[PDB]
Amino acid sequence: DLRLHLLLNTSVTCNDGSPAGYYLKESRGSRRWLLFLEGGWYCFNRENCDSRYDTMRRLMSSRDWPRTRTGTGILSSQPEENPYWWNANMVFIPYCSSDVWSGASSKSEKNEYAFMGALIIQEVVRELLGRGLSGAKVLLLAGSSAGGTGVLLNVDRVAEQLEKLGYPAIQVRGLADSGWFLDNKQYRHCAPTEAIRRGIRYWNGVVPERCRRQFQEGEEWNCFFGYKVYPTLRSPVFVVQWLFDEAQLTVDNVHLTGQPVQEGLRLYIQNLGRELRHTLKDVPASFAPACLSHEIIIRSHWTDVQVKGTSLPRALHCWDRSLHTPLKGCPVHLVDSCPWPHCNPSCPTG
Template sequence: MATNHKVRVLVWLRRWSKRDWAIAISVFAVIIFALTLTLSLNSFSDDSYSPSPVDSTADDIVDLTLLRKAKSRGALCLDGSVPGYHFRKGFGSGSEKWLLHVEGGGWCDTTESCSFRAGTPLGSSNYMERRISFSGILSSDPLQNPDFFNWNKVKLRYCDGASFAGHPETELKTGNNLFFRGQLIWEALMDELLSVGMSRAKQALLSGCSAGGLATLIHCDDFRQLFPKDVAVKCLADAGFFLDEKDVLGNYTMRSFYHNVFTLQSLAKSLPKECVEKMEEPSECLFPHEIIKNIKTPVFLVSPAYDWWQIQNVLIPGTSDPHGYWKKCRRSILKCDPSQIEILDGFRKSFLRTLSDFQKKTDGGMFINSCFAHCQTWLTETWHSFNSPRLNNKTIAESVGDWYFNKRVVKQVDCPYPCDPTCIHVDFS
């Protein structure tokens, strides 16, 4: 009986196509990471923090380095531990080129959710993996990462809960022994990387995923200021363009959440001064559509128009669906009925309207596909592989490379779901 069962399983597995396997592997990675990060509801976490995608090779295993002068500078994670990063030295023609990738992982907006986070890799280096695998945009394989494979590559671990933008002014008010030092962490990380060779960079790219994508936008111009004017410096935000949209019940859930993060961790000094001074509600300056108005450095935006994280937390947060009407659709766009797709399409249209001014920027780039996805640069399957999503027959990696090296103008926007057969849709059901 057991033998017959095994035979049936083998037959079933052999029927899978190469693309079926690619989708299964990518979805498995996302689900494992999401389950690993079961933070409180107010923490707005996501799966993208995980540093161990399943598609890396042994050659891309990179050790954790703890920040050397962190304690003397007061640059500490939420729990007071020392922040860290992973550094893979470049080689050949990439020895004087630097690519930084900021880890994602949501935010915390209350002392309770920050205290919980302080006991996870997103709030403490005590829980971070000591060795992680680099893949996607961090891969050292030229077949997986054609333009950046031999660059110096750094993954910045995220442990402050506010996109490296927090300040310690409110620490004593919480009474929870929490450290809000995101800005200090950022500055200390940059200084250490400059001291180990980044100061000699001829080209540099700051990238980040999700909350790390937001951090990339916040610090993009600061990053540019670290280098001489003749150094080519650009920024790439992956799934970091969060919308200030009403949820399906008409509430500004994300706006309220960002207000709490802004207030709790005193973010004002890390956000554009022009915005903070003129806005009636300064916390709204945390939204990318406000930040990007002031960025002078060239920026590339990678984003799915049907970002599953934003659908689940901005458009349809759990509290907005008490009767479970959206339950299946929130987990998989394949399970949405026509009326639900119409609402998701409205969210997509709002996203594209928000990007209308950015589209006019001559030095900006975009890759906006219609996949039910979130971060797409950190996994090889979605960054650059035989099965990767494509627009105009270009992968994300190829599009980013064309933009960074000024090969052509890259402003790619996909048609609405379900027209794109190259999409790898995450399915949580």
Template structure:
């Protein structure tokens, strides 16, 4: 069983990152942090808080980092959904961080059928033709030491997401119902990593794979493969932000997200990626972190809100399961939830804590589970490291 909600936060990201050792290391400590269950107070605050600005707490504007398209993408078969070359943004490190690398996998949901994938082909989530040529690096990607004290001077990379299946597909057939689709997420990630290895990642002393949302799920899926790319004596860890999606019933007692994942797995033939997954499970179940994490060896830090806003809106109370719109206000503003809805949210929180408590056996893993009504916290200066950042017993994530 997980510790009670009021248990003290004994460790956090900085301490966890600095711990050396791999799985099975003697004396490694599993760090767990749970925020006191002041549900309405805490969630109301973050639901009503003003939108986070892109500027850091120091007043500096985030750095603008240019887009690099993967070279030779077509010959490598590493293509976005529409057949365009994938891309990434690289900001070089300096000083003591010149041989340290942080790789971030972009998120952005998934497409479950040809219609939704076709729609993504006309957006930055399916084509590099629509990607911004420059983006801001904030939060864990910031080069501002006051905002990002542990990683500000590292080499930092954001790999753009344009395959619709958490960088996991590898389907050779391109023609579907008369339209060309490229389900090549696995090849995209491999091509980008190989290019970065030549740019210095291959000589990294330490490296950190991170990701948000669908990129957080990709972080779980690819963590060990990332470790295998790097020198044996390098220190390698992973952080998944808002990527622990739950296989739970929604408010209408349907498994909406499982059905969605079944479609994604079947469309992009992902079952072959999860050969260790129980064959008696439905295809989509193998795509959930609860199953993926069972075989991960590399240390992982789990950053997740117990009341993940995206999951409340799309997993617990999706519009398709709320024809009377009784959850419309609650799903957008937690302070407007009825007592019954709050009770259901508490049940969702318990499902999250029960699922994550299974990771206690992984002694060199860590986690920071707070009660904020948000989704993804590492890329936002407001939630990552600012005077208003989430606190657990007065402890910040990065301090």
């Protein structure tokens, strides 16, 4: 199990002002550290955050967090469940800031909620340095869904933080799972771009510096979209993305209720998969199966899906080798080309 530590700096808080924190399982003798960012959508105004506080309070508060959590999938310490990094130091960072890990605003006289996701990551890293992270060779910042977008938004800041703190030997890398979204037109016409734009102002949200300099003031929402922020990043980032991610379809107002799919929706879905595949063409480390699903890396059966005969744990291992010219039998760019969900036979059964 991973054990809860609430942040010693209690000014770095979840939405309701309770301390943020992290769950840790150390593996002495390993110099690999996996820091995983939980997902869970976001909220962007007082009214929708108040509703989230009523019925999704664990995503806004640490007051009810359990003392331990079981590491699953890529956070498992069992080689059978985690062929990739089972011996690593494991860190699960709960998502309690509702800001896609972008916020740097405290609760105050003018703010009902604190949005501190970017500062939570920074503070977790700082406190871990005294618990063995100072001796690390690789820090893999991973995350799923909103946490996967959080990786894209924060990996270079973690790298810069460690450089400035005097740890230039720690190699910071990112693993963004299910956080690579398209700002596309809905199938039927709140929306991702508008919600993010409102969120950034409400959260005092921050984006990576090079991306911010490209898009400039008022346009920072662009940096929440993988295909726009990824080319600006310096740290190596492996992108895991279902071609037909359920969250993407949800924001696109697509719901597949078994009934036969007619031409307009068929074309819409096929073009979405084509667009996603296009955005990954120049992402050398990627795993993008043609499945309708959501998230992958912390589920216990994450080992089962394969693209072109290669599983994600294998692809991640090949990526590790590449970061020591392509490797014989050890590919890292794995994007399905077939055009309809479940054309890959290894897709999750749901």
